[PDB]
Ligand binder design. Structure first.
Ligand SMILES: *[C@@H]1O[C@H](CO)[C@@H](O[C@@H]2O[C@H](CO)[C@@H](O[C@@H]3O[C@H](CO[C@H]4O[C@H](CO)[C@@H](O)[C@H](O)[C@@H]4O)[C@@H](O)[C@H](O)[C@@H]3O)[C@H](O)[C@H]2NC(C)=O)[C@H](O)[C@H]1NC(C)=O
Ligand SMILES: *[C@@H]1O[C@H](CO)[C@@H](O[C@@H]2O[C@H](CO)[C@@H](O[C@@H]3O[C@H](CO[C@H]4O[C@H](CO)[C@@H](O)[C@H](O)[C@@H]4O)[C@@H](O)[C@H](O)[C@@H]3O)[C@H](O)[C@H]2NC(C)=O)[C@H](O)[C@H]1NC(C)=O
Ligand SMILES: *[C@@H]1O[C@H](CO)[C@@H](O[C@@H]2O[C@H](CO)[C@@H](O[C@@H]3O[C@H](CO)[C@@H](O)[C@H](O)[C@@H]3O)[C@H](O)[C@H]2NC(C)=O)[C@H](O)[C@H]1NC(C)=O
Ligand SMILES: *[C@@H]1O[C@H](CO)[C@@H](O[C@@H]2O[C@H](CO)[C@@H](O[C@@H]3O[C@H](CO)[C@@H](O)[C@H](O)[C@@H]3O)[C@H](O)[C@H]2NC(C)=O)[C@H](O)[C@H]1NC(C)=O
Ligand SMILES: *[C@@H]1O[C@H](CO)[C@@H](O[C@@H]2O[C@H](CO)[C@@H](O)[C@H](O)[C@H]2NC(C)=O)[C@H](O)[C@H]1NC(C)=O
Ligand SMILES: *[C@@H]1O[C@H](CO)[C@@H](O[C@@H]2O[C@H](CO)[C@@H](O)[C@H](O)[C@H]2NC(C)=O)[C@H](O)[C@H]1NC(C)=O
Ligand SMILES: *[C@@H]1O[C@H](CO)[C@@H](O[C@@H]2O[C@H](CO)[C@@H](O)[C@H](O)[C@H]2NC(C)=O)[C@H](O)[C@H]1NC(C)=O
Ligand SMILES: *[C@@H]1O[C@H](CO)[C@@H](O[C@@H]2O[C@H](CO)[C@@H](O)[C@H](O)[C@H]2NC(C)=O)[C@H](O)[C@H]1NC(C)=O
Ligand SMILES: *[C@@H]1O[C@H](CO)[C@@H](O)[C@H](O)[C@H]1NC(C)=O
Ligand SMILES: *[C@@H]1O[C@H](CO)[C@@H](O)[C@H](O)[C@H]1NC(C)=O
Ligand SMILES: [O-][O-]
Ligand SMILES: [O-][O-]
Ligand SMILES: [Cu+2]
Ligand SMILES: [Cu+2]
Ligand SMILES: [Cu+2]
Ligand SMILES: [Cu+2]
Ligand SMILES: [Cu+2]
Ligand SMILES: [Cu+2]
Ligand SMILES: [Cu+2]
Ligand SMILES: [Cu+2]
Ligand code: NA
Ligand code: NA
Ligand SMILES: [Zn+2]
Ligand SMILES: [Zn+2]
Ligand SMILES: [Zn+2]
Ligand SMILES: [Zn+2]
Ligand SMILES: [Zn+2]
Ligand SMILES: [Zn+2]
Ligand SMILES: [Zn+2]
Ligand SMILES: [Zn+2]
Ligand SMILES: [Zn+2]
Ligand SMILES: [Zn+2]
Ligand SMILES: [Zn+2]
Ligand SMILES: [Zn+2]
Ligand SMILES: [Zn+2]
Ligand SMILES: [Zn+2]
Ligand SMILES: [Zn+2]
Ligand SMILES: [Zn+2]
Lengths: 497, 497
């Protein structure tokens, strides 16, 4: 790997990760983008150098560092027109943030329109030299990150507004398509007798995936950067933008075993070795697995996850037991999603800049009705009741700036106010569900809250949770370079966006 | 009403059933098309006079008489390029068929592309002078037919390939839109103390509807033209192309009560009186209801329906207990649906004409792989396992030429080989379901089997069940007028289709 200090150069290039050549957005010459690493406490200084030349995939860009709280550096969070104006082609912009109090598996991606789907996405790991789970595994390194990515042969802006799944699923940036000539599968090497911490990261633009490894079980020790009690499972449904670490004990006979990541829809199954990669024990022949899958007997259920460290749920143990309860009503009108009867339209002036300029009340912030102003140091409860009025469910919603307690998970009618998992992306399930979260407002600034299906986000499925507006300016000093972004951006010709 | 002998003139016209004026396809100057009636045993002679002028809504046409078996008149069934070539504009074509052995609630619609969605659809009732349910009701007439229709402001060929619901729901051809000026609601008049046989018919192009009447229950006595044991319910989910008769006892206080037909998706609910009509007791003021709905305590479940007359299930009481078992595998690739890896593409030469010309084996019939050849006088079992690979579920599949036993309903894991309902359209449910039907091949000819969501049909979600190919010509003599259709049609300029 690279980091915690690194240049990240954005270019357009031809890639063929599934055998099919297409133009993409790449970072330091690759997609998925390079693994960034550091250790808990590190200061990351990631200098984003925009050399993009292709307007169809957007020459402007903005990067979000998914999972990091950005406390005191809200201007670095990334969402275009919420936390910054986009960077322009031929300019650079330094993200500079510290990670005092987190460690785990993260990722980073474009947060402008659907650009991450065209390739600007990769994994990001912060190691804990005092990891409480260290004794559970031997080996944890660049070679134990596993990324999943949906890959499309037609560019995000050129295909359907809402594609029906992708052409291939890439595991560690490789995967096969339905087509006559099989391309190369990714191979993840292990030595028999060792235990691995695999760090599974969904870089998906849209579908969720069901991930399993033939003949092996997986002990989950982390979810979305939060340490968990160990939970042994044999299958994991992982939604866009989620992470898990799981320990794999390579204690099976030296062989090749299929690693499977079956998307929820699109080109499903494993015919011809699609949606697959290869776990290869050292000394197994260099051929495809012939291992066989079985029906899971212990599939992951989110209600079975619990934080390793006690993490009290904000507020009091009843529906509405908090300072500010919010129920989000989803709708859709064929082209745009809505939350409480508003589709998000990104404003000219980034929300953070509006707030720094003196707009502190919801009524004064734009887009009107999509920006919620929350009091500081308070408990918040948000429910996302699923509905057929919001197709493409289950929508995985993501809240910037925090980890939330999932007091009610999809597929469950239990409320858990005791020891629920905390995470940052949560499936909001299917009609009948009423997935409910809590968090405390301990992080002054405007934070995005949106579906992480990037096609839905781009069609307006988002609101902004602006907490502690009166202390936002003091809490989040902006660097001059950040103040320069809007004047550069607003000067661009439309053909250079 | 009109029939059993009638002219049905097809024109284009401007209509505004929900307050919004648009060009449509109308029959005898109206949409929904006029109620056709006769009595069991009648010979229907429906002369379809095509005076359509608008190519965007198709100037050619073909009509199907939904629910009728057409035994010995397969050439009259209607599906374009399965049973006939379309009629041309400036020509007429006589459908002439008998109904010796059926009576109940039916409907008729264009069976060319998506034309019925642009307005060519209406109800069709065959009364039974010896109806076994006659003593259950007092009044059964033109005024007790209730039709449901999804209505779109943009024409079928001009809007989305797969629309997200309709703009309004019309009940008896009237209904409101979301818009500032409420248009007129339909009013269904009853006199207190009388009992009505209401004949509910879904003319839907796509969504299913949940139908209820405030303060009243509904005793189902017929499903898809099959008499049932009486089943009292307080809500009915009715899928596209299904019918029910239910008896309503007008025994509530003289008032206005809301009639509700809530589509599965689109503009849902009842704000502003959308998706509604008015049951008005004679002497109630001429105003909107203020009645209130309640959660159903006895919603219809299909497994609760049973034929009034014992109807033995074909074959023997186990999975695969039949002469020819068939499992249909659904898929979708973003624009086209597939069944067993074939999308239906309608052939130049109608399937029936191919068969009359001497093609009798599946291998010789086109489109290859979409035409199944079934032996005569045999038991057939077909399963339609639901899958996310076929979005837009639950798909209501329809089999021409017969009524089938629904041995396994959606939402149910029971197999009923004893007294299951027989019907002709069945919801194939949601992933997890494996809806299964049986029928006997007692009706020589090619019969269509397809999703009755018209957008899906048009995107290829259909196969042809060609039974008794060797006796099809003998069983189904064709009139000269029918033999003339293809030469007229094949001579048309493309701008006159
Ligand atoms: C800027 O970024 C754009 C988005 O990535 C690039 O868009 C590309 O634009 C080209 C030219 O219009 C499109 O070309 C189409 O490609 C297919 C070819 O597909 C292949 O078909 C067989 C099998 O499927 C394949 O093996 C052959 O090699 C073909 O390449 C054609 O069917 C179309 O007629 C047309 O050629 C690309 O599809 C499109 N790319 C994407 C990813 O959407 C644009 O080229 C970029 N600008 C520059 C300077 O690179
Ligand atoms: C043949 O059949 C076609 C399909 O029905 C007809 O297609 C029509 O084509 C016209 C002209 O291109 C389209 O016109 C568009 O209509 C809307 C107007 O909508 C209304 O907007 C407000 C509120 O929404 C409304 O109250 C006003 O009265 C407007 O009428 C415009 O927004 C577009 O710019 C354009 O005018 C029709 O939409 C389209 N109809 C349908 C049903 O899709 C075609 O006219 C027919 N040929 C003949 C000779 O009648
Ligand atoms: C999903 O969960 C949310 C949050 O629990 C539900 O919204 C809440 O619904 C409750 C129950 O109706 C409302 O409770 C209150 O009840 C009292 C007593 O009648 C009433 O006086 C209050 O005005 C209120 O109705 C509560 O207000 C509401 N909370 C919020 C923040 O809106 C929601 O209905 C659930 N949605 C689904 C589809 O399950
Ligand atoms: C939906 O239901 C259909 C029909 O029941 C299922 O297809 C049938 O699947 C069964 C069970 O696997 C097959 O049974 C047979 O088992 C014997 C014993 O192993 C085997 O030797 C036979 O070759 C056969 O596999 C049966 O063939 C098959 N029937 C047909 C017509 O294909 C289907 O799997 C169900 N789908 C879902 C998703 O539930
Ligand atoms: C991995 O697991 C599979 C199935 O769980 C193993 O195959 C089973 O092994 C038992 C014990 O030998 C056999 O008796 C069963 O017939 C097998 N079950 C099935 C469903 O095939 C398999 O050998 C293991 N290893 C590989 C490489 O697949
Ligand atoms: C769905 O809702 C969106 C947002 O209301 C509609 O988009 C707006 O439509 C009006 C009329 O064109 C414009 O004033 C805005 O510029 C639109 N915003 C957009 C397009 O992002 C959209 O047209 C609605 N779609 C349908 C099919 O009704
Ligand atoms: C129709 O039914 C509703 C509700 O089922 C009636 O309202 C209920 O009537 C009881 C008896 O008077 C009241 O005590 C309850 O408060 C009502 N329940 C609810 C949910 O409101 C209603 O009066 C009936 N008639 C009309 C025209 O709505
Ligand atoms: C989905 O499948 C359909 C049917 O296979 C594809 O349509 C065919 O595509 C090829 C290439 O254009 C043609 O030879 C046929 O004429 C097409 N039939 C049609 C368009 O009805 C369709 O292109 C596939 N769609 C996608 C997005 O892959
Ligand atoms: C915020 O408010 C609580 C009261 O609920 C108060 O006791 C405390 O001092 C504040 N907490 C923090 C962490 O600043
Ligand atoms: C068809 O076949 C059955 C045998 O299963 C035979 O007994 C009978 O004569 C035939 N039935 C009819 C109705 O023609
Ligand atoms: O992550 O947005
Ligand atoms: O009915 O097709
Ligand atoms: Cu993210
Ligand atoms: Cu994020
Ligand atoms: Cu979504
Ligand atoms: Cu985000
Ligand atoms: Cu029909
Ligand atoms: Cu039919
Ligand atoms: Cu369908
Ligand atoms: Cu049909
Ligand atoms: Na809606
Ligand atoms: Na598929
Ligand atoms: Zn190039
Ligand atoms: Zn510049
Ligand atoms: Zn537990
Ligand atoms: Zn507003
Ligand atoms: Zn926080
Ligand atoms: Zn406890
Ligand atoms: Zn503060
Ligand atoms: Zn442009
Ligand atoms: Zn006109
Ligand atoms: Zn002519
Ligand atoms: Zn029963
Ligand atoms: Zn074929
Ligand atoms: Zn029959
Ligand atoms: Zn019995
Ligand atoms: Zn025969
Ligand atoms: Zn044309």
């Amino acid at each position: 790997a690279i980091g915690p200090v690194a240049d990240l150069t954005l270019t357009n290039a031809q890639v063929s990760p599934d055998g099919f050549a297409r133009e993409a957005v790449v970072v330091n010459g690759i997609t998925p983008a390079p693994l960034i690493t550091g250790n808990k406490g590190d200061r990351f200084q990631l200098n984003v150098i925009d050399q993009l030349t292709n307007h169809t995939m957007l020459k402007t860009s903005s990067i979000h560092w998914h999972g990091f709280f950005q406390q005191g550096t809200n201007w670095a969070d990334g969402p275009a027109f919420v936390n910054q104006c986009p960077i322009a082609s031929g300019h650079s912009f330094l993200y500079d943030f510290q990670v005092p109090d987190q460690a785990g598996t993260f990722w980073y991606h474009s947060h402008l329109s659907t650009q991450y789907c065209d390739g600007l996405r990769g994994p990001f790991v912060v190691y804990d030299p005092n990891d409480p789970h260290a004794s559970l595994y031997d080996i944890d390194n660049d070679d134990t990150v596993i990324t999943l990515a949906d890959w499309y042969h037609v560019a995000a802006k050129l295909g359907p507004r809402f594609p029906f799944g992708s052409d291939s699923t890439l595991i560690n940036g490789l995967g096969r398509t339905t087509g006559i000539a099989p391309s190369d599968l990714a191979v993840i090497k292990v030595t028999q007798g060792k235990r691995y911490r695999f760090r599974l990261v969904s870089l998906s633009c849209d579908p969720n995936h069901t991930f399993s490894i033939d003949n092996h079980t997986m002990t989950i020790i982390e979810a979305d950067s939060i340490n968990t009690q160990p939970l042994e499972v044999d299958s994991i449904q992982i939604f866009a933008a989620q992470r898990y670490s799981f320990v794999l004990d390579a204690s099976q006979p030296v062989d090749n075993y299929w690693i499977r990541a079956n998307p929820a829809f699109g080109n499903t199954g494993f015919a011809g070795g699609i949606n697959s990669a290869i776990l290869r024990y050292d000394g197994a022949p260099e051929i495809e697995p012939t291992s066989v899958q079985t029906t899971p007997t212990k599939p992951l259920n989110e209600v079975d996850l619990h934080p390793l460290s006690p993490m009290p749920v904000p507020g009091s143990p009843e529906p509405g037991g908090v300072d500010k309860p919010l129920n989000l009503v989803f709708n859709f009108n064929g082209t745009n999603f809505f939350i409480n009867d508003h589709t998000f339209v990104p404003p000219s002036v980034p929300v953070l800049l509006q707030i720094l300029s003196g707009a502190q009340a919801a009524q004064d912030l734009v887009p009107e009705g999509s920006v919620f102003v929350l009091p500081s140091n308070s408990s918040i409860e948000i429910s996302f009741p699923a509905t057929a009025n919001a197709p493409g469910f289950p929508h995985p919603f993501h809240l910037h700036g925090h980890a939330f307690a999932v007091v009610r998970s999809a597929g469950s009618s239990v409320y858990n106010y005791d020891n629920p998992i905390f995470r940052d992306v949560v499936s909001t399930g299917q009609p009948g569900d009423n997935v409910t979260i809590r968090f405390e407002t301990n992080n002054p600034g405007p934070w995005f809250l949106h579906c992480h299906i990037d096609f839905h986000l781009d069609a307006g499925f988002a609101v902004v949770m602006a907490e502690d507006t009166p202390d936002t300016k003091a809490a989040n000093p902006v660097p001059q370079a950040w103040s320069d972004l809007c004047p550069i951006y607003d000067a661009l010709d439309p053909s250079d966006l």
